[PDB]
Curated annotation (Swiss-Prot):
Source species: Piscinibacter sakaiensis (Ideonella sakaiensis)
Reported function: Involved in the degradation and assimilation of the plastic poly(ethylene terephthalate) (PET), which allows I.sakaiensis to use PET as its major energy and carbon source for growth. Likely acts synergistically with MHETase to depolymerize PET. Catalyzes the hydrolysis of PET to produce mono(2-hydroxyethyl) terephthalate (MHET) as the major product. Also depolymerizes another semiaromatic polyester, poly(ethylene-2,5-furandicarboxylate) (PEF), which is an emerging, bioderived PET replacement with improved gas barrier properties.
Assembly and binders: Monomer.
Consequence the record notes for mutating residue 208 to F: Displays decreased enzymatic activity on PET film and on BHET. Exhibits improved PET and PEF degradation capacity relative to wild-type PETase
Enzyme Commission designation: 3.1.1.101
Residues noted as binding poly(ethylene terephthalate) in the record, renumbered to the chain: 57, 131, 155
Keywords: Disulfide bond, Hydrolase, Secreted, Serine esterase, Signal
Reactions performed catalytically: (ethylene terephthalate)(n) + H2O = (ethylene terephthalate)(n-1) + 4-[(2-hydroxyethoxy)carbonyl]benzoate + H(+); (2,5-ethylene furandicarboxylate)(n) + 2 H2O = (2,5-ethylene furandicarboxylate)(n-1) + 2,5-dicarboxyfuran + ethylene glycol + 2 H(+); an acetyl ester + H2O = an aliphatic alcohol + acetate + H(+); a butanoate ester + H2O = an aliphatic alcohol + butanoate + H(+)
Subcellular location: Secreted
Name of the protein in its database record: Poly(ethylene terephthalate) hydrolase
Cysteines joined through disulfide linkages: 173-209, 243-259
Taxon lineage: Bacteria, Pseudomonadati, Pseudomonadota, Betaproteobacteria, Burkholderiales
Effect of residue 155 to A: Exhibits highly impaired PET degradation capacity relative to wild-type PETase. Also displays decreased enzymatic activity on BHET
Length: 261
């Protein structure tokens, strides 16, 4: 277990910012992806896990940027990427996600980097929107040492992720008409029998319901942070926040399995 920061509350997790001061930089020479921004805590008081976040088809870092400061402020290094092409498919997005994690591991070993010695390279997580969410699930299927996955409105050509053993939180958007819940997010969720998993559907949400500028940042932020704290840090202080039905008028559906309180 790798417990960092104060004992959590509903209030401290719903807030815009967690306890740590966040800085960021632009990756100089991206290795295996288009562009990256690294968000990091300046005063975490220990090494922190790393999370790589990938946008959807046509999209850039702006769509997923809000997660950087939100997660970093609770004790993570977060890299948000632009893909080599905005028209990359999910397999490519997954390779590029794992390339961003690789470079964060590299920068951890680079004395000139702001994140020199700040990362525990044994503790990594994946997130992303739509095809980037599909890519996060492919990353998890291919890399079972990953500690957590928290894709949003995921799409893949196949809904069968039955091999995934990584703790997986799926954010779904009730009224998604790009990747409908009934044909994407929910069948992806249903396919996974071997993991701690959760399904949180946002009431009236369109396809962008968990993107930068969403009106549910208190709820989505709290669940995203709690999931990553619980599973990346093995921080049982977050067991209730991670596993609980949040009991919110913004949630139209909640499912969870193998998630202990």
């Amino acid at each position: 277990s790798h417990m960092r920061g104060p004992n959590p509350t509903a209030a401290s997790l719903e807030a815009s910012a967690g306890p740590f001061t966040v800085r960021s930089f632009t990756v100089s020479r991206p290795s295996g992806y288009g562009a990256g921004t690294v968000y990091y805590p300046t005063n975490a008081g220990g090494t922190v896990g790393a999370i790589a976040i990938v946008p959807g088809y046509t999209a850039r870092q702006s769509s997923i940027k809000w997660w950087g400061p939100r997660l970093a402020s609770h004790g993570f290094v977060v890299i948000t990427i632009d893909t080599n092409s905005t028209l990359d498919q999910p397999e490519s997005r997954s390779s590029q996600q794992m390339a961003a994690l690789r470079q964060v591991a590299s920068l951890n070993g680079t004395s000139s980097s702001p994140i020199y010695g700040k990362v525990d390279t044994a503790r990594m997580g994946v997130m992303g929107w739509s095809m980037g969410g599909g890519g996060s699930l492919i990353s998890a299927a291919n890399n079972p040492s990953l500690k957590a996955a928290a894709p949003q409105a995921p799409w893949h050509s196949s809904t069968n992720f039955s091999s995934v053993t990584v703790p997986t939180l799926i954010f779904a958007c009730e009224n998604d008409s790009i990747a409908p819940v009934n044909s994407s997010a929910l069948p992806i969720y249903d396919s996974m029998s071997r993991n701690a998993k959760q399904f949180l559907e946002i009431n009236g949400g369109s396809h962008s319901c968990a993107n930068s500028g969403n009106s549910n940042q208190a709820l989505i932020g709290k669940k995203g942070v709690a999931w990553m704290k619980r599973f990346m840090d093995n921080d049982t202080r977050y067991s209730t926040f991670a596993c609980e039905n949040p009991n919110s008028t913004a949630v139209s559906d909640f499912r969870t399995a193998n998630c202990s309180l």
